[PDB]
Amino acid sequence: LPIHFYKPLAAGAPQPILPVRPERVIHFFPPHVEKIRARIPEVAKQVDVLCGNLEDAIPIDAKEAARAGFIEVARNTDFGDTALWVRVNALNSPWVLDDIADIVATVGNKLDVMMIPKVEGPWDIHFVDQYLALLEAKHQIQKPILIHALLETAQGMMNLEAIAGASPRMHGFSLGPADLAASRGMKTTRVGGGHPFYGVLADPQRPFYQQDLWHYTIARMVDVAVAHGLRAFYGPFGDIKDEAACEAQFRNAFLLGCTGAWSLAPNQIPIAKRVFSPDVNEVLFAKRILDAMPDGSGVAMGKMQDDATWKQAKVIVDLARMIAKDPEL
Amino acid sequence: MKLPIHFYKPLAAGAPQPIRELPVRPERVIHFFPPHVEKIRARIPEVAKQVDVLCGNLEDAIPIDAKEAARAGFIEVARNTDFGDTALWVRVNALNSPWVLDDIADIVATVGNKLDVMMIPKVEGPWDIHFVDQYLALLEAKHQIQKPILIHALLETAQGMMNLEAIAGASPRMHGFSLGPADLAASRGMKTTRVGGGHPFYGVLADPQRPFYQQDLWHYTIARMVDVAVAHGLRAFYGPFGDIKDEAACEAQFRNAFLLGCTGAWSLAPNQIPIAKRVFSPDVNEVLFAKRILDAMPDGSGVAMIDGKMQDDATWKQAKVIVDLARMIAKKDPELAQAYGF
Amino acid sequence: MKLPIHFYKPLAAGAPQPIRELPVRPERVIHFFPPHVEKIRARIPEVAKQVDVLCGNLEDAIPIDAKEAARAGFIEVARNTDFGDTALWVRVNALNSPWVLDDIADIVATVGNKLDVMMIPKVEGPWDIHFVDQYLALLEAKHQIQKPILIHALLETAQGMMNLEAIAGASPRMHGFSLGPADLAASRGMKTTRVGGGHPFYGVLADPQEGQEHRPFYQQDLWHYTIARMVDVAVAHGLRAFYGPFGDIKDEAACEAQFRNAFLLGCTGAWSLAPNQIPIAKRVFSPDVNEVLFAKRILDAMPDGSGVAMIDGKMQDDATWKQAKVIVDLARMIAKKDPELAQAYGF
Amino acid sequence: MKLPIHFYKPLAAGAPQPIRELPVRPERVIHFFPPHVEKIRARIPEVAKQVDVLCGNLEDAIPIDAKEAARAGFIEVARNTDFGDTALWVRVNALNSPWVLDDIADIVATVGNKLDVMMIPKVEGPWDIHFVDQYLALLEAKHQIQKPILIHALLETAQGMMNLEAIAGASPRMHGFSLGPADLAASRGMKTTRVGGGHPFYGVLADPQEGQEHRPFYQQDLWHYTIARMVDVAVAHGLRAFYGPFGDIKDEAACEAQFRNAFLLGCTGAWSLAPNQIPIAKRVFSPVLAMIDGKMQDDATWKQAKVIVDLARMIAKKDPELAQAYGF
Amino acid sequence: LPIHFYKPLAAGAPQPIRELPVRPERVIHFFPPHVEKIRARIPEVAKQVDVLCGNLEDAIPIDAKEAARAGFIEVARNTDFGDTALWVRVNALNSPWVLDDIADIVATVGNKLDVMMIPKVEGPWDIHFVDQYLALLEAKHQIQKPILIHALLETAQGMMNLEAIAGASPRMHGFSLGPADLAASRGMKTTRVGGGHPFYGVLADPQEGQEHRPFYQQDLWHYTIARMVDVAVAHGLRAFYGPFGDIKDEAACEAQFRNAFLLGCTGAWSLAPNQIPIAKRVFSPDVNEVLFAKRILDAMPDGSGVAMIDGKMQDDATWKQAKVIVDLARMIAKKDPELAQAYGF
Amino acid sequence: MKLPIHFYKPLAAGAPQPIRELPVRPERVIHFFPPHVEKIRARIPEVAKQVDVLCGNLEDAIPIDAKEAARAGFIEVARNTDFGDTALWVRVNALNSPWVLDDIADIVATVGNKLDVMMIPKVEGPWDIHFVDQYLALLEAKHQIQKPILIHALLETAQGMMNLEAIAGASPRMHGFSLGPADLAASRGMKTTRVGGGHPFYGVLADPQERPFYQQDLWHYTIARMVDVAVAHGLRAFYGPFGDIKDEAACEAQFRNAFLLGCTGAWSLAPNQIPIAKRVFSPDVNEVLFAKRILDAMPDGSGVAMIDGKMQDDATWKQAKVIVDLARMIAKKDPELAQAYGF
Ligand SMILES: O=C([O-])C(=O)[O-]
Ligand SMILES: O=C([O-])C(=O)[O-]
Numbered sequence A: 001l002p003i004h005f006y007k008p009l010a011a012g013a014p015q016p017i018l019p020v021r022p023e024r025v026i027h028f029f030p031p032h033v034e035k036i037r038a039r040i041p042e043v044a045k046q047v048d049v050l051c052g053n054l055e056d057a058i059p060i061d062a063k064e065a066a067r068a069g070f071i072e073v074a075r076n077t078d079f080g081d082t083a084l085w086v087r088v089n090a091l092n093s094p095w096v097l098d099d100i101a102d103i104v105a106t107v108g109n110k111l112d113v114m115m116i117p118k119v120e121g122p123w124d125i126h127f128v129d130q131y132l133a134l135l136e137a138k139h140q141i142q143k144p145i146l147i148h149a150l151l152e153t154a155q156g157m158m159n160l161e162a163i164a165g166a167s168p169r170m171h172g173f174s175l176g177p178a179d180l181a182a183s184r185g186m187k188t189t190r191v192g193g194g195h196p197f198y199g200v201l202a203d204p205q206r207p208f209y210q211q212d213l214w215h216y217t218i219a220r221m222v223d224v225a226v227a228h229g230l231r232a233f234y235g236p237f238g239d240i241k242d243e244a245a246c247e248a249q250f251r252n253a254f255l256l257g258c259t260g261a262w263s264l265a266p267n268q269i270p271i272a273k274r275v276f277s278p279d280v281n282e283v284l285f286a287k288r289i290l291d292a293m294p295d296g297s298g299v300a301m302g303k304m305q306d307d308a309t310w311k312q313a314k315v316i317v318d319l320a321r322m323i324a325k326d327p328e329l
Numbered sequence B: 001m002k003l004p005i006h007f008y009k010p011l012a013a014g015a016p017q018p019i020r021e022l023p024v025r026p027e028r029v030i031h032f033f034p035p036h037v038e039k040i041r042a043r044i045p046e047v048a049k050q051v052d053v054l055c056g057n058l059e060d061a062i063p064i065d066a067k068e069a070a071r072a073g074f075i076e077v078a079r080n081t082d083f084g085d086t087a088l089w090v091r092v093n094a095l096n097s098p099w100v101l102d103d104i105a106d107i108v109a110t111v112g113n114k115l116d117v118m119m120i121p122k123v124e125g126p127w128d129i130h131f132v133d134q135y136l137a138l139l140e141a142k143h144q145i146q147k148p149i150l151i152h153a154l155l156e157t158a159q160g161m162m163n164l165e166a167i168a169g170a171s172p173r174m175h176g177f178s179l180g181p182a183d184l185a186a187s188r189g190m191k192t193t194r195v196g197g198g199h200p201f202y203g204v205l206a207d208p209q210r211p212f213y214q215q216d217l218w219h220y221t222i223a224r225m226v227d228v229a230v231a232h233g234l235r236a237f238y239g240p241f242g243d244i245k246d247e248a249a250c251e252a253q254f255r256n257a258f259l260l261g262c263t264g265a266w267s268l269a270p271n272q273i274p275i276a277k278r279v280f281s282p283d284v285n286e287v288l289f290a291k292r293i294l295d296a297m298p299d300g301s302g303v304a305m306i307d308g309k310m311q312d313d314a315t316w317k318q319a320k321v322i323v324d325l326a327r328m329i330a331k332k333d334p335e336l337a338q339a340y341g342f
Numbered sequence C: 001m002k003l004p005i006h007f008y009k010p011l012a013a014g015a016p017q018p019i020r021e022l023p024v025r026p027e028r029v030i031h032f033f034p035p036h037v038e039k040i041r042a043r044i045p046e047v048a049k050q051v052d053v054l055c056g057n058l059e060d061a062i063p064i065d066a067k068e069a070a071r072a073g074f075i076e077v078a079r080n081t082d083f084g085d086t087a088l089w090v091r092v093n094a095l096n097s098p099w100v101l102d103d104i105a106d107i108v109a110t111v112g113n114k115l116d117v118m119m120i121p122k123v124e125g126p127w128d129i130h131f132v133d134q135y136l137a138l139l140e141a142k143h144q145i146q147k148p149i150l151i152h153a154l155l156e157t158a159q160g161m162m163n164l165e166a167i168a169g170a171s172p173r174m175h176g177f178s179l180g181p182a183d184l185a186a187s188r189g190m191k192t193t194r195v196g197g198g199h200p201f202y203g204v205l206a207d208p209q210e211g212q213e214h215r216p217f218y219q220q221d222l223w224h225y226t227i228a229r230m231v232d233v234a235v236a237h238g239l240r241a242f243y244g245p246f247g248d249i250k251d252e253a254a255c256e257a258q259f260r261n262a263f264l265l266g267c268t269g270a271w272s273l274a275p276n277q278i279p280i281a282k283r284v285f286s287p288d289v290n291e292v293l294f295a296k297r298i299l300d301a302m303p304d305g306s307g308v309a310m311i312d313g314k315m316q317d318d319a320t321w322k323q324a325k326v327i328v329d330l331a332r333m334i335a336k337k338d339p340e341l342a343q344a345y346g347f
Numbered sequence D: 001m002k003l004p005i006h007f008y009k010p011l012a013a014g015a016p017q018p019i020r021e022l023p024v025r026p027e028r029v030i031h032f033f034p035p036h037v038e039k040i041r042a043r044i045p046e047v048a049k050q051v052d053v054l055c056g057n058l059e060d061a062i063p064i065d066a067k068e069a070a071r072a073g074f075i076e077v078a079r080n081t082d083f084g085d086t087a088l089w090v091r092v093n094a095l096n097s098p099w100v101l102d103d104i105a106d107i108v109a110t111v112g113n114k115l116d117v118m119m120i121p122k123v124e125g126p127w128d129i130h131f132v133d134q135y136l137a138l139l140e141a142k143h144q145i146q147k148p149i150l151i152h153a154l155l156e157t158a159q160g161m162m163n164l165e166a167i168a169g170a171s172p173r174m175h176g177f178s179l180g181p182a183d184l185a186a187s188r189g190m191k192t193t194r195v196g197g198g199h200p201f202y203g204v205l206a207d208p209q210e211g212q213e214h215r216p217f218y219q220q221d222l223w224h225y226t227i228a229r230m231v232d233v234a235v236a237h238g239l240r241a242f243y244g245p246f247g248d249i250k251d252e253a254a255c256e257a258q259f260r261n262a263f264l265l266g267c268t269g270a271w272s273l274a275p276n277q278i279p280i281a282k283r284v285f286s287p288v289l290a291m292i293d294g295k296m297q298d299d300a301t302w303k304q305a306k307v308i309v310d311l312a313r314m315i316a317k318k319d320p321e322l323a324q325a326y327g328f
Numbered sequence E: 001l002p003i004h005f006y007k008p009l010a011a012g013a014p015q016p017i018r019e020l021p022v023r024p025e026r027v028i029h030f031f032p033p034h035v036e037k038i039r040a041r042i043p044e045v046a047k048q049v050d051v052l053c054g055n056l057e058d059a060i061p062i063d064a065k066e067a068a069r070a071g072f073i074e075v076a077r078n079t080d081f082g083d084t085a086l087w088v089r090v091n092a093l094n095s096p097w098v099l100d101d102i103a104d105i106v107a108t109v110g111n112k113l114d115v116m117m118i119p120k121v122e123g124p125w126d127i128h129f130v131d132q133y134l135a136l137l138e139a140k141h142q143i144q145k146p147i148l149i150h151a152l153l154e155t156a157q158g159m160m161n162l163e164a165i166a167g168a169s170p171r172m173h174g175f176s177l178g179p180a181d182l183a184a185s186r187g188m189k190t191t192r193v194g195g196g197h198p199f200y201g202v203l204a205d206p207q208e209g210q211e212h213r214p215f216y217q218q219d220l221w222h223y224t225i226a227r228m229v230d231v232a233v234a235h236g237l238r239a240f241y242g243p244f245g246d247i248k249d250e251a252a253c254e255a256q257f258r259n260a261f262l263l264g265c266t267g268a269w270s271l272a273p274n275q276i277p278i279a280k281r282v283f284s285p286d287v288n289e290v291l292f293a294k295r296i297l298d299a300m301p302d303g304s305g306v307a308m309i310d311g312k313m314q315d316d317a318t319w320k321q322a323k324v325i326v327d328l329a330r331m332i333a334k335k336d337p338e339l340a341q342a343y344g345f
Numbered sequence F: 001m002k003l004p005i006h007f008y009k010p011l012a013a014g015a016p017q018p019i020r021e022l023p024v025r026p027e028r029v030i031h032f033f034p035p036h037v038e039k040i041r042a043r044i045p046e047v048a049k050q051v052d053v054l055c056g057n058l059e060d061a062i063p064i065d066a067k068e069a070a071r072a073g074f075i076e077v078a079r080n081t082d083f084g085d086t087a088l089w090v091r092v093n094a095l096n097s098p099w100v101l102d103d104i105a106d107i108v109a110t111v112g113n114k115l116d117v118m119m120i121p122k123v124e125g126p127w128d129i130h131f132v133d134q135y136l137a138l139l140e141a142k143h144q145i146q147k148p149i150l151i152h153a154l155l156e157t158a159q160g161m162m163n164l165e166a167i168a169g170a171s172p173r174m175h176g177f178s179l180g181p182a183d184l185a186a187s188r189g190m191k192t193t194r195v196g197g198g199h200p201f202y203g204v205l206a207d208p209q210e211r212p213f214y215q216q217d218l219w220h221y222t223i224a225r226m227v228d229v230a231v232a233h234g235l236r237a238f239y240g241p242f243g244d245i246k247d248e249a250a251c252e253a254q255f256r257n258a259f260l261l262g263c264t265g266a267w268s269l270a271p272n273q274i275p276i277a278k279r280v281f282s283p284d285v286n287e288v289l290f291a292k293r294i295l296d297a298m299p300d301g302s303g304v305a306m307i308d309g310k311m312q313d314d315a316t317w318k319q320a321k322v323i324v325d326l327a328r329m330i331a332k333k334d335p336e337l338a339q340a341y342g343f
């Protein structure tokens, strides 16, 4: 219910809440690697969000090293305006209890968002919320840590509305294309990409028009997230070299209404920040509409505008302005 | 949410019996018009005969300074005109606005007996339907309105998309849904200012052999709307196509909607009327397979098979609807007269 | 909607224990046949070995005066034949129809111990499953059937699509779903030029190019939503999603392309309406070699299936291991009657 | 569950249209009879006159080797007897039993157009209703039954009590509910000293008072929760709630107490197991209950006023003292 | 929906309140506003009751609806209710008087009305209508504090949908039992409005010697009141016993009210002057109980552990039981000098 | 809210397989003890033999400053004791409390293999259960716990009463519910300080006789609702504490009410309550005898038989087994009942 929904889960925990900042790129780093950890302060200034990875691609015998590594660099660095995230290990894993506990105790006040792998339903959120609450109380954390659900299974997608509404800590969703495709039996040629042979064959009179595999999944993620006041994110794109397909894929997500994407390499940072910023062409035709009608009321014009298009324009202009603090247009 | 035994009761003493089935009539085009401007007011009796459905507009595209005028406007023209077979609809202001109380009050008081459907903008959930249902019921009772004013839901918000089943099932007054892709794009945060066509940057990039195949922004949205609506015996509609000039694009979008299963589209100017009518006219193969259902089952009883497909009371009742709707279109189009065969 | 503790109980005294897991077997092709035609019935034992699943048809395209022949035909062929590895299905008549009572009761009374799945047309909600589930259970106890007859639901109405979660979870007899695109298209205001396929006029038109006259028109797929929705619900319930039939029996390319779109989204298999379609299905819905090879690495890294491991960066546990055993056991069973794949899967 | 647009459609082609409103008639007593016994079958034409409802029993108290005889017995009396205004009901065997498929099939075939209500034992949830609903429809169509046979749910398990709202709204065939006291008690693990009874040791002990050592023990009603929940759920769905059996045949006083309690809480009637219980039920469950007496009146309370008036006249059309007393 | 629950449902109307106001609500005194003699003495009566509630619905004849409407507006406009809350029971949602009842009252005296009681509520849809309608009116007439909603439970359907009704809006205040209408809706038989029946009871088993079987009467309203309390309290709302119709049987009235109080109801209605003092006495904590509870709070300053007090043993939980009783006692004592004395403040 | 296909899966790799059926054992009396009191701690090996269930208590009645001693105390006496046929329970602190994280981790780490049931207080909804389920599993995998630790939900809050079905269905760890009358009275705002008996001024006043007041049962609705939700989920309902230790006549009456409405057993707060709970909640003899008959009429437990006009089947056979088994295990330590049941 609404009455106890906003009440704290544990006594001494901070009052429940979305904070407004740009989240165009979520940059992942391996905490166990000294070379990457050494340059975190310099790299943090080049990204909107910086996310520590304890999960996929961190070896079993390096879980404790990655965990401790994350804790060292988040304690010692001033991250300025860069949001600090962490992806902990899965809720069925041998590392998750230690992950969450240690990170809250040492750097809880520094952590904005916690990414939970493979969220299957509201019960997963209920556990993380209550656990974080008790740990926040224990270590006197002033600002509650938000929860970001990674969608990696069919059950999760089916349970998306329940997951979205399970806690006031919810921040958003990221698509986990590798695992989600594997779960569904969905076949793709690149992580976070489509497939060349998914398309319609024209009637013999032959051409083959390729279709997007992720349309339903993204459209669904965006409706559920936005209806709850959360943010949807495209996850990673796995083919680091194919920069044109990355931009194509990221751009599709931006237009359907995602806020950002993951970067898994330095070359993906500029693509993401570029793509999830509004195109200056559209900001002009947008500012044209805001100028045509001073307020929401009215009609304009060879395309019909109104209060609705004014709202469409306000979205694109409210975003392009938040980012520039740069384009500056 | 309501139990069947109560669902079909009138919400006010004296208010008209809630309907069981949707009234069957032409709705291939819904022609919007600003009622505050006298030039268009004067042509309404002309335009009325051109269109299946006429719909006055009090909400978006009507400035704050002329809302009152759009209200009076709508009543003036509705009083004076006999609309014949053309349906009279109205789009009132939002349920949070200062104009909606009087919008609904004065219209039922003056022209309720002529108003066929009321269109509610920015519906978030079933509570919205509930209020309007109950408010209409009480107003219909006061002014002794003879048949229930139906509710048409504008699908303009993320919350509405999420709550689409609850909305569809909230009232027997429910007629159907119209996609409002301008508002729905602002609500979702879809990054376009365009009002519901393709978009150049939404597409798939092929593998190195680089071709770029545009995709349809609204496949999920319309597919979802058709399923929910049709499951509840309601009608989905595509809404506005804001690029008035680009008739090539408008036909394609109207045709997409038609093939997914919508019943009709909006027209925002005279050039879109004939396009909407062309696209949304029933499939000839549809109409002729229905006639066969009807002729093979004398009084809709028993069971008969046609092209290897068993037919029954459900398929017969859907046959009589499509045939009925065909005849009604043929009455004001000669091409479709012999096409369906009337 | 039933409680877990009651879900797996038999609905009749003497009915066999319901399953907690779909049997794993090849289901790449569901080959249909009219059991009334005596020439097809003669060739069934030969056709058996060429297909993963043989499904008798009593419903669409079996005439009213043929219904009782098809019912007896199917009972006759099933009693005479030993299907070996081939699964025996049957699409009975609709739940409003005059034949369905006798269809189910006669088939279970006679050959119930040989039927693996029963296909129910035009399933509109959990109530339809509840009827069939309870009916089968009482027939199964009377005739002492040894393993449960599963229910396969045919998606033919808007109502069904909207109630798909409720259908999927209605019973432990649930096997999965097939799309009936002719009916589902009719039910929705959907326009299709062929039963299996979409429409050429469903497409996106480009913005005006200053240069050329011809604005490009990119055809779109009508069935994307439907199939993506069908796969998510089915897989989330532990069931399988199947594409239905493709009508243009001539058009083998279109048949390959639509079968393939379904496979790439996660469907297990397709219907074959004609002998040319049989090999088109088996080719497309064969498990991918990479998935099979990868699954073998999981099984190797976790011998007894316990503990936890990490392969290609990814944690492996009792769920991934169990899932990897399913595809390996399925690849084995396919390689058993297909030496070309035995080499590819590396057995 | 099902949507209002589809709720009232037939479930088989040729099956009679679902009712939108429950039929009004006296249901003060539902008199059970074992149809395998020849003596009782003889007396049914007489007994039909003395009861509002006659219910043949195929389930409890009918032995395993008498099931076929009971199934045939009930059919014999069904097609012979002219029931007049007396409604005819049957309690088939449970849905998990080896007799229920033939119970329903044979009865609908032979005497289906004389059956008003079918009583289903041990209704656990809406799935049980879905099965019976769909099965009756297919049998109704095959045999061209002219009006729908209604479903009356026996509540005999805790699950059924928990699923009560979902059961109630499962089908427009739904008529209402009866208490299966013995079986509901045994499912819950309640302890009663008689079927349909209660327990003298369920009570509230007073505090010690003054100097009087004897602390009074106030007995409590065990069924108050059950019947209150059953009535609220039944009446909200437009159905009727009945008290089940009262197994202590000889204690006519206690029988009256229990039936009266049900009636005061809103139940329509009760079962009679023997002929001494017939008059107890009819006595106890017999009652006439704009702006008059401070309350507004409308379409809703006019319909309910007409239901009680019609019931009174039909009650009166056979009962002359009550015809004289009600003023008809 | 929790983010959209606490939004204003109209632009101009005030922010939906985060929690209920904290005043005593032991008696809800009803008055027919169409009667001049009654309106004249409302300022005097108001000083003796926690809540005063105008009635436009039942007991008001059809001829008097306009007069009762106008009479309520005139009383509320001219009177200063002080610490007394002002309610009104408007007519039913299916009736020809309700549109005007709500509209006229909000326009004229919206800033003086604390709670609007809605008759015959059957589901959350009823609540949706009123919330939205009040929101629009409040905006139009710039009403500073939002008018709360109070649901009368007078139907089986209402009892069945109780959870949905309670969660339907943040305006929700609580529930009152409408036991006459609820008995009729249910088919109950009561001998009095909102009262038990003499013949609802248990017959003891046959004895050996006395041969008169004792007959232990039972409470018709247990299930109902227990369900209302649980649902209301679980949503942060208050439950109220409705009207006790038998004005002259003050013993029965007291007993019925007290039963409600024990099971967790906050107050009951008053229909006549004799019921005012009964409701205030019955819905005020007992003196001894308050004192027995007073020293528990002393025995455990922390509210933690065990502690012997007189002969009894208390723990964290009985401390909570105690804090409730004492918190209420201290609130009533602010405006009753006599109870303040006896409670020991 | 979880599907049956996922419901019986462990929530952590290494965690024991969830159960599909409650263990059957005597649970007529839940004896509570404060584990921080050495004098009581020292007697537990003897008291253990006198009771069906022993439940350590870390929550209400344990002072704030004794909470850590109470935890350590529970661990000490559980480590060093062979509880034989007696079940070991613990009531940990509330989920919004500074002691509960460590309560659970430490108990599971040290004595998790001896712990049968973990009682959770002040349960408000399924989310509480979800948290405990997932927490226990991660600890169970970490410490290689062989059998799943079950969850007992204390019914003490108005929210818990309203959310009873969701709580009951939330996990295959669910054991059952105990009515916590003091906390439930405070939560509801019931106007009593008594802990779970009658109240003299809750009653029905009769009409003038040619004026008797019949006291009513405060807890009819609450127990009736608890029994229905729990039995439908294959769980067990229990009456909680009866606080008036002196008044044994009232305690027996309140326990018997619970028993007559379908509760399995009650809490004992003092040694005089132990025999009372044991006496009241022992299976009635006609229930055991009728159960014996069901097993004899169907030696296999298969097919369909009939007894006293009532069809018997695979489900009723399953129930008769439970009762007989339970009566057999009670006889094992009580010669008097052994006779009455026929062993
Ligand atoms: O509702 C509208 O007009 C829109 O948003 O297109
Ligand atoms: O907390 C408890 O145990 C209680 O309320 O009785």
Ligand SMILES: [Mg+2]
Residues within 6 Å of the ligand: A308, B060, B121, B156, B180, B182, B183
């Ligand atoms: Mg709009």
